[PDB]
Design a protein around this nucleic acid. Structure first.
Ligand SMILES: Nc1nc2c(ncn2[C@@H]2O[C@H](COP(=O)(O)OP(=O)(O)O)[C@@H](O)[C@H]2O)c(=O)[nH]1
Ligand SMILES: [Cl-]
Ligand SMILES: [Mn+2]
Ligand SMILES: [Mn+2]
Ligand SMILES: [Mn+2]
Length: 535
RNA sequence: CAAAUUU
RNA sequence: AAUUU
């Protein structure tokens, strides 16, 4: 039936300047050599993304879907959800959020300037009074950094971001924010992925795995998921929102937003020209995450039922899921996954790479990450979250006139503190840099480098300073990644850490704390590492 | 552009 | 600020 997009032929213009690296990368030319492999998805490449995502869609539901959808509405109704005062919504706008066409930006909105507050009042009026006129949207390309992958086709084209003017975004929040805070958790229960910390995510997966008499696992991702979302899915999304206790004024707004924005509409490039028209998810609206997550969860749980997966235990984060099930033999498991996939494909949620059953937790990737295991200080198996380091490393070498990567070094050091690649590579580099800059005190993205041990033990457990004997998979993947980016191998980072460490220790103070906890892995005579006041 | 987590 | 979807 419905085509996902249609194109005037007008280009998808840049919303500013997209910078190139420079001939010297002073912060990261000691981290890695192959800077030619590090690129940022440009808006010229948007054209190609459009081609990939524009395609005709056909959807066939069935008892299993219908049934799941029923049960989900019954969940939805145990939820009461209130409107948000125009002001409260203004306050939830991000600091730098892209300004309005109508002469004002996020400063005004967050501070409750009167020009801003009136415009918004009017815009909300128009939603209440008018429930069909489509709402224009801007379309732009997302700029992300990756390592090239010649094996997987050279350079990814830029993903497409599609969003309404600022005023509309506030209104969206008024109508929907509270729902987003309550509905998913209530529809999906323990399956709701974003609810968990990474540690809980891991415990959850292990508990699921443990529960089975004979576990089988897989993950599923949808190809260009936002393109796969149909007018009907969105309307079914509305009817799920509506299934709550709502102020009548909300219902009108929801329904008006649904019909005028969410379900489709015209798109304009940043120079103002009509770009095309959209009949699927706009990734840019408030409902993007919740939408994707709920919808994905319906189709998924239906496919599970269509395919006979026994005792499924799910975890959904957007279009990404993991199911851990009771195995029915490999022969049947393969048949069921095929079924599952046909069902999803019928429901208009077809796979990128088609899924496969696995019987070992390490072999299941979702949200670009996976569980692995190493040994801790006393010889116990310690499970943790990790990932291919390619992209984080690539991003660690993204230096331009207007951008420093030091923050991403830190971001990843915190998030993946127990991973061998953070511990040996990223930390070593990060500290090495700052000691030489002599800018350790300096706060970065509101964090103090010298806190790190505390920060890390709070979030990952003191075991993160003592883990050893990492998995074959993980060593292979790390090695291979450094080799791919022309970084030094681990043996060299070992040396460099001994040095960094010695300097940090001899620096005294918190530096020495850092030097001792964070680099204890680097020494043959490893110390007794006890817990920290600060956490 | 939106959300979630981490800070 | 970082990351993810
Ligand atoms: N608003 C917004 N949504 C995103 C972004 N990245 C991913 N998503 C949403 O999550 C969906 C699934 O993500 P992913 O599997 O990573 O990409 P895709 O399936 O190729 O589109 C996308 O189709 C988007 O709707 C982003 O930067 N902004
Ligand atoms: Cl242990
Ligand atoms: Mn996907
Ligand atoms: Mn309605
Ligand atoms: Mn995904």
């Amino acid at each position: 039936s419905s085509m996902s997009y249609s194109w005037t032929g007008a280009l998808i213009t840049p919303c500013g300047p997209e910078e190139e690296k420079l001939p010297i990368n002073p912060l990261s030319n000691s981290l890695l050599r192959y800077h030619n492999k590090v690129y940022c998805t440009t808006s010229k490449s948007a054209s190609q993304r459009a081609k990939k995502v524009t395609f005709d869609r056909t959807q066939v539901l069935d008892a299993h879907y219908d049934s799941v959808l029923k049960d989900i509405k019954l969940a939805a109704s145990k939820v009461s959800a209130r409107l948000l005062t125009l002001q409260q919504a203004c306050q939830l706008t991000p600091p730098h959020s892209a300004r309005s066409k109508y002469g004002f930006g996020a400063k005004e909105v967050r501070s409750l300037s009167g020009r801003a507050v009136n415009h918004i009042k009017s815009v909300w009026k128009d939603l209440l009074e008018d429930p069909q006129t489509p709402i224009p949207t801007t379309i732009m390309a997302k700029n992300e950094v990756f390592c090239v992958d010649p094996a997987k086709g050279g350079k990814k084209p830029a993903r497409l971001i599609v969003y309404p003017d600022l005023g509309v975004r506030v209104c969206e929040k008024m109508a929907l924010y509270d729902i987003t805070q309550k509905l998913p958790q209530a529809v999906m229960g323990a399956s709701y992925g974003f609810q968990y910390s990474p540690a809980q995510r891991v415990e959850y997966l292990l508990k699921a795995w443990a529960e089975k008499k004979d576990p089988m696992g897989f993950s599923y991702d949808t190809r260009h998921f936002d393109s796969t979302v149909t007018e009907r899915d969105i309307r079914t999304e509305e009817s799920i929102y509506q299934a709550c206790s709502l102020p009548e004024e909300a219902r009108t707004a929801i329904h008006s937003l649904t019909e005028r924005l969410y379900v489709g509409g015209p798109m304009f490039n940043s120079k103002g020209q009509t770009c095309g028209y959209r009949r699927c998810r706009a990734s840019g609206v408030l409902t993007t995450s919740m939408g994707n997550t709920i919808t994905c969860y319906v189709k998924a749980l239906a496919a599970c039922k269509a395919a006979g997966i026994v005792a499924p235990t799910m975890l959904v984060c957007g279009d990404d899921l993991i199911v851990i099930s009771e195995s029915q033999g490999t022969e049947e498991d393969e048949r069921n996954l095929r079924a599952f996939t046909e069902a999803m494909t019928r429901y208009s949620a077809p796979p990128g790479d088609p899924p496969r059953p696995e019987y070992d937790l390490e072999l299941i990737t979702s949200c670009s990450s996976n569980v692995s295991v190493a040994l801790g200080p006393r010889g116990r198996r310690r499970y943790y979250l990790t990932r291919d380091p390619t992209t984080p490393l690539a991003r660690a070498a993204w230096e331009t006139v207007r951008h420093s990567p030091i923050n991403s070094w830190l971001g990843n050091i915190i998030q993946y503190a127990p991973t061998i690649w953070v511990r040996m590579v990223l930390m070593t580099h990060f500290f090495s840099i700052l000691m030489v800059q002599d800018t350790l005190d300096q706060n970065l993205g509101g964090v103090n480098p010298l806190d790190l041990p505390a920060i890390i033990e709070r979030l990952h457990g003191l075991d993160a300073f003592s883990m050893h004997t990492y998995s074959h998979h993980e060593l292979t993947r790390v090695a291979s990644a450094l080799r791919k980016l022309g970084a030094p191998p681990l043996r060299v980072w070992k040396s460099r850490a001994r040095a960094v460490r010695a300097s940090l220790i001899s620096r005294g103070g918190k530096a020495a704390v850092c030097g001792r906890y964070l680099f204890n892995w680097a020494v043959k005579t490893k110390l007794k590492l006890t817990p920290l006041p600060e956490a």
